[PDB]
């Protein structure tokens, strides 16, 4: 009848929001051009040859507050010209040879990046890049998160110094990043490592995996982690990804129907593909499950677009998943819309979809 | 008053057509998805994990007879499961680390691929992959062309054994075939005598920052131009050799059956995934058009070129429409030429109208005016 969560607010430094995500590429132009058309993200800021960067090409896509950065290295024959100081040509080709197209950096806005970096290392974090102050404007620092992903700290005194603003329409309703999930071999150690240096508390849950969720004090920076337990997808991931790494990004949309009707039109002409849709029983069982949250027309709309729906104690959740973004069966995208919990709306409203494993199964047991 | 052309038909083996072009990628899925939407090429055949290939992912785009192959390597921890036998994981990462996104293979249909390979090596060609017979169906062989590009020989007894046909309503911007494939090289003389030395390709005569000869097969339908940098405004070909870390393919020219359609489609998509184009010639250029190709293009077709930014050139045999994209990837190296040829219809003879060498001048004296 009642579910109660706790929140010690045990953050070891002041954390604000997700700042951006840095993909590492072989050729960043094509990847950014496809992501832009397939997700509806505007070309916003560049740091390439045309801006004078002879170390790496970096292209930034935005939609709402969501910031996808796409970095690919230039030839070593053409350091000081790189806008992102923590970039190394060799670490980049190693990452792409080993893991392929994937997320390098999970970056978050924090009060002071040297403050965050100092405590993190002192509380166990493995350092990657120390605090570099860019033009006395932004501070940047990187610690190891899981595998070859880095948690990157960004703090302030069009995106970073050295980037040039790209002026211009494209917009499918995606407004912000919601959570970023990492697949690791052993949950226990990875969980005690990350929470050990961030002070992130565990967000409670209302298969082939085990999943805990680490969260900041206001529960707006959400970092779930999966463990491998039909062969487990997480295990397949660890093989094709040659280790631990970010599994999926969840992108909050202000209207999942719009974003899906846009993203679905473009699946065959450049965009992104989606998982095969649940059996029609699933949406018939919707009417007596979230019928007091979604109208019947909104339920018909989910069946047309293949959207999963889940509920927990505080709210209701709409969500759908793409197919792997690149060549390897590794990283994919989650589109979500959260309903309820509007105090502002509290993050994690509706959970993460853990219930859909069952409900989707017993949809297939029927039918 | 008169330009006369010769043709010794000195081919050392039987050569038919351009078969396909193999790009080497870091991630072939995104590159092929972008090229498909930005050029209007249909997803036709795959050889990835979903077909059982654990060495490399290969995705084929088509439009008319044009075949763009996009290959990217999988992890070595998962040779026998690879559909393309000449693929090596290390040669691929070396290529992409060194040159970035570029063309690996220029492949052409020939009568017998072991026949072509044997003579080529015997006439100087540097071998890369010997003749491998796939499922007693198609033969494949590769010799070095320029730098790390390979001339690949393909002969027959959806695309290769091991590939699975992709059913698609379908995208199509009017591109129908590949016209020519150009390589930038440090020294023209040696590269020219090397390639023609083992193919027997004759020189196609020409009616800047570069020196350009054109090597051609007997029917002048497989066209392989080569550029050289002229030193001492800095030569683009020289900049290419720096960013490309050596010689390599510079541009592919894609014949369209209607360059206006193909560009009104391709320009719509420049800002939403597709390809961008060079800044348009000054309006004087298109004014001088009316008394230059006015007996070939109507006034409406001339206004249409000004709207789409198309260059026009003429030679002894015919007239040429052409326009160039910006570099396809991160590096200022490889780009695309869209072309439509007019005249010379005996069938239409390749090289009709030349290649645009006159436009350097016409473009300039347009800017000297205005
Ligand atoms: O948000 C999360 C984090 C923990 C792992 C997880 O299961 C979550 C999902 O994004 C999610 C939700 C539902 C489904 C299902 F079962 F409907 F397919 C799948 C996922 N998932 O793993 O991407
Ligand atoms: O087709 C060729 C091969 C030889 C070299 C060459 O210049 C050709 C062109 O594709 C061409 C023609 C005209 C222009 C101009 F005038 F616009 F600059 C440029 C090129 N080009 O991109 O090489
Ligand atoms: Fe999720
Ligand atoms: Fe050309």
CATH of the domain at B54: 3.10.180.10
* Torsion angle of C-alpha atoms A328, A329, A331, A332, degrees rounded to 10: 120
| A185 and A138 belong to one structural domain | no
CB A334 within 8 A of CB A321: yes
Considering the domain architecture, whether residues B53 and B199 belong to the same structural domain is answered as: no
* Torsion-angle region of B151 (φ positive above 0: left; ψ -120 to 50: alpha; else: beta): beta
- Measured CA to CA, the distance from residue A102 to residue A94 in angstroms comes to 12
Q: Are B321 and B310 in contact (CB under 8 A)?
A: yes
Q: Could A77 and B242 be called an inter-chain contact, meaning their C-beta atoms sit closer than 8 Å? A: yes
Cα–Cα–Cα angle for A163, A166, A172, nearest 5°?
115
Interface of B with A (CB under 8 A): 25-31, 33-38, 43, 48-49, 57, 72, 74-75, 77, 93, 96-98, 100-101, 168, 171, 242-243, 245, 271-274, 328-332
**Residue that has been written with the tokens 């004014």 in this structure:** B287
**Beta carbons of A94 and A107 less than 8 angstroms apart:** no
**Which one, of A178, A337, A172, lies nearest residue A261 by Cα?**
A172
Tokens of B112: 């017998």
My answer on whether B234 and B139 are in the same domain is: no
Residues A243 and A100 in one domain: no
One domain, residues B134 and B65: yes
β-strand A332-340 against A245-253: which pairing, if any? parallel
Solved using: X-ray
Ligand 1 atom with minimal separation from the A353 CA: 12
Do residue A196 and residue A211 come from a single domain? yes
Same domain, A196 and A287: yes
Are residues B155 and B106 part of one domain? yes
Q: In this structure, what token pair is assigned to residue B358?
A: 């006159």
Domain that includes residue B113, residue range? 1-172
Phi, psi of A179 (to 5 degrees): -155, 160
Residues with CB under 6 A from ligand 1: A 179, 181, 211, 224, 226, 248, 308, 321, 334, 352-354, 356-357, 360
Known binding site for Fe cation: residues of B?
180, 251, 337
Domain boundary, last residue among B172, B192, B227: B172
User: Is residue A250 within 8 Å of residue A177, measured between CB atoms?
Assistant: yes
Residue B87, classed as helix, strand or coil, is coil
Residue A275 DSSP code: P
Q: Per the structure block, which two tokens stand in for B196?
A: 């023609």
What atom in ligand 1 is closest to the CA of residue A275?
Answer: 18
Resolution, expressed in angstroms to one decimal: 2.6
Q: Rounded distance, CA A66 to CA A57, Å?
A: 20
3-state secondary structure A196-228: HHHCCEEECCCCCEEEEEEECCCCCCEEEEEEE
In the block, tokens 């959207």 appear at: A307
Which contiguous run of DSSP H or E holds residue A196?
helix A187-198
Identify whether the C-beta of residue B257 lies closer than 8 Å to the C-beta of residue B174: yes
C-alpha A242/C-alpha A147 separation (Å) is 9
> Which residues fall within 8 angstroms of residue B43, CB to CB, at 6 or more apart?
A268, B32, B36, B59, B60, B61, B166, B168
Smallest CA separation from ligand 1 atom 13, residue: A353
What is the sign of the dihedral through the CA atoms of B353, B355, B359 and B360? negative
Last residue of a domain, one of B172, B193, B227: B172
Read off φ and ψ for residue A282, nearest 5 degrees. -45, -50
Distance CA A200, CA A216 (A): 5
The torsion angles phi and psi of B201, rounded to 5 degrees, stand at -70, 135
Give me the phi and psi of B115, to 5 degrees please. Answer: -60, -50
Please, are residues A306 and A279 in contact by the beta-carbon 8 Å criterion? no
Total Cβ atoms within 10 A of residue A303: 15
Pair (B165, B180) in one structural domain: no
| Nearest Cα residue to atom 12 of ligand 2 | B356
B interface test, pick of A61, A270, A332 with most B CB neighbours within 10 Å: A270
Same domain for B209 and B134: no
Please tell me whether residues A133 and A237 are part of one structural domain.
Answer: no
Nearest residue, CB atoms, A27 vs list B31, B37, B273? B31
How many other CB atoms are found less than 10 A from the CB of residue B45?
A: 21
Rounded distance from Cα B292 to ligand 1 centre (Å):
65
Which residue in A51, A98, A166 sits closest to B74, CA to CA?
A98
The residues near A36 (Cβ < 8 Å, ≥ 6 apart) are: A42, A43, A61, A170, B272, B273
Rounded Cα–Cα distance for residues B322 and B313 (Å): 8
List C-alpha distances in Å: B263 to B277, B307, B325, B334: 10, 10, 11, 19
Residues after which chain B is discontinuous, using a C–N cutoff of 2.5 Å: 78, 157, 168, 207, 232, 346
**To 10 degrees, the CA torsion angle through B21, B22, B28, B29?**
40
* SS3 (DSSP) at A144: strand
Give yes or no: residues A145 and A280 share one domain. no
The neighbour count for residue B95, using CB atoms within 10 Å, is 18
Residues in chain B: 370
Q: CA B72 to CA B89: how far, in whole Å?
A: 9
Domain boundary among the residues A120, A155, A171 is at: A171
Among candidate residues A21, A311, A298, the one with its CA nearest the CA of residue A150: A21
Q: Which helix (H) or strand (E) holds A119?
A: helix A113-122
CA B263, B269, B270, B275: dihedral to nearest 10 degrees?
Answer: -70
Q: How many A×B Cβ pairs under 8 Å? A: 106
Domain count, chain B: 2
- Under the phi-then-psi rule, with left for phi > 0, alpha for psi from -120 to 50, and beta for the rest, what region is B136? left
CA atoms within 13 A on the CB side of B350: 23
* Other Cβ atoms within 10 Å of A307 Cβ, number: 24
| A75 contacts B100? CB cut-off 8 A | yes
User: For residues B36 and B171, is the Cβ–Cβ distance under 8 A?
Assistant: yes
What ranges in chain B are assigned the alpha helix state H? Answer: 28-39, 89-99, 113-122, 188-199, 236-243, 259-268, 283-289, 299-308, 359-368
Q: List the one residue out of A63, A8, A18 whose CA is nearest residue A223.
A: A18
SS3 A296: helix
Q: Does residue A193 sit in helix, strand or coil? A: helix
Query: A153 - beta bridge partners?
Result: A108, A141
Supply the residue whose CA is at minimum distance from atom 20 of ligand 1.
A353
**Residues B339, B321: Cα–Cα separation, whole Å:** 5
On whether the CB atoms of residues A338 and A345 are closer than 8 A, the answer is: yes
The SS3 call for residue A113 is helix
Q: How many residues does chain A have?
A: 367
**How does DSSP classify residue A282?**
H
């Amino acid at each position: 009848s009642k579910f109660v969560r706790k929140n010690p607010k045990s953050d070891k430094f002041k954390v604000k929001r997700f700042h951006h995500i840095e993909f590492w590429c072989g050729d960043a132009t094509n990847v950014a051009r496809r992501f832009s058309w397939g997700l509806g993200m505007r070309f916003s800021a560049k740091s390439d040859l045309s801006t004078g960067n002879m170390v790496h090409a970096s292209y930034l896509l935005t939609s709402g507050d969501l910031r996808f950065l796409f970095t690919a290295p230039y030839s070593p024959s053409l350091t000081t010209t790189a806008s992102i100081p923590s970039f190394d040509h060799g670490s980049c080709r190693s990452f792409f040879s080993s893991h392929g197209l994937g997320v390098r950096a999970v970056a978050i806005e924090v009060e002071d990046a040297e403050s965050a970096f100092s405590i993190s290392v002192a509380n166990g974090a493995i350092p990657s890049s120390p605090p570099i102050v860019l033009n006395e404007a932004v501070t940047i620092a990187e610690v190891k998160l899981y595998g070859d992903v880095v948690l990157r700290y960004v703090s302030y005194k069009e995106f970073l110094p050295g980037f040039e603003r790209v002026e211009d329409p494209l917009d499918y309703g995606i407004r912000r990043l919601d959570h970023a999930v990492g697949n690791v071999p052993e949950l226990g150690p990875a969980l005690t490592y990350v929470a050990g240096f961030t002070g992130f508390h565990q967000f409670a849950e209302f298969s082939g995996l085990n999943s805990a969720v680490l969260a900041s004090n206001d529960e707006m920076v959400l970092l779930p982690i999966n463990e491998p337990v039909r062969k487990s997808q997480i295990q397949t991931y660890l093989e094709h990804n040659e280790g631990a790494g970010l599994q999926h990004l969840a992108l909050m949309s202000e209207d999942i129907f719009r974003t899906l009707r846009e993203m679905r039109k473009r699946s065959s002409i450049g965009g992104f593909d989606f998982m095969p849709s649940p059996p029609p029983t699933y949406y018939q069982n919707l009417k007596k499950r979230v019928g007091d949250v979604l109208s019947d027309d909104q339920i018909k709309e989910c069946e047309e677009l293949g959207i999963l729906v889940d509920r927990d104690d505080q709210g209701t959740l709409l969500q759908i998943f793409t197919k792997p973004l690149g060549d390897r069966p590794t990283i994919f995208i989650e589109i979500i819309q959260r309903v309820g919990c509007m105090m502002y709306q509290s993050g994690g409203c509706g959970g993460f979809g853990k219930g859909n494993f069952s409900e989707l199964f017993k949809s297939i047991e029927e039918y």
